[PDB]
């Protein structure tokens, strides 16, 4: 109780603990919708000029 | 242009001296194209 207590010494407040784990799971949403990926020949046209 | 006798009594081939101020020409053409919609996306069949 008086000597076996945990304390946040040096190394416990290192910055890499926030630098190693990305923020991707806390900000990105599970979209689960397919990407567009439409072709260019369909949108631009057939170029009937020549 | 300031004289109605000249403005109103004139011939087919002439106009007002103030017609020289009509220096802009706008030419329009209205055409057809095809707006295709498929798989959630739009596009134009004819590029040019």
Swiss-Prot record, chain A:
Swiss-Prot/TrEMBL induction comment: Expressed in the late phase of the viral replicative cycle.
Record's function text: One of the minor capsid proteins that constitute a network internal to the major capsid proteins and outside the lipid membrane. The minor capsid proteins glue and stabilize the capsomers.
Assembly and binders: Interacts with the major capsid protein.
Compartments in which it is found: Virion
Protein name in UniProt: Minor capsid protein 3
Swiss-Prot record, chain B:
Induction comment from the UniProt entry of this chain: Expressed in the late phase of the viral replicative cycle.
Top-level taxon of the source organism: Viruses
Post-translational modification remark: Myristoylated at the C-terminus. Glycosylated; highly branched oligosaccharides. The pattern of glycosylation sites are unusual.
Subcellular localization(s) per the UniProt record: Virion
Record: glycosylation sites: 10, 17
Anything else known: The viral capsid possesses up to five major capsid protein variants. They behave as asymmetric capsid components.
Summary of the function given for this chain in its UniProt record: Major capsid protein self-assembles to form an icosahedral capsid with a pseudo T=169 symmetry, about 190 nm in diameter, and consisting of 1680 major capsid proteins trimers. The capsid consists in 5040 copies of the major capsid protein (hexamers), 60 copies of the penton protein (pentamers) and 1800 minor capsid proteins of different types. The minor capsid proteins form a hexagonal network below the outer capsid shell, stabilizing the capsid by binding neighboring capsomers together.
Protein family: Belongs to the NCLDV major capsid protein family.
Stated name of the protein: Major capsid protein
Portion of the full sequence shown: 390 to 437 of 437
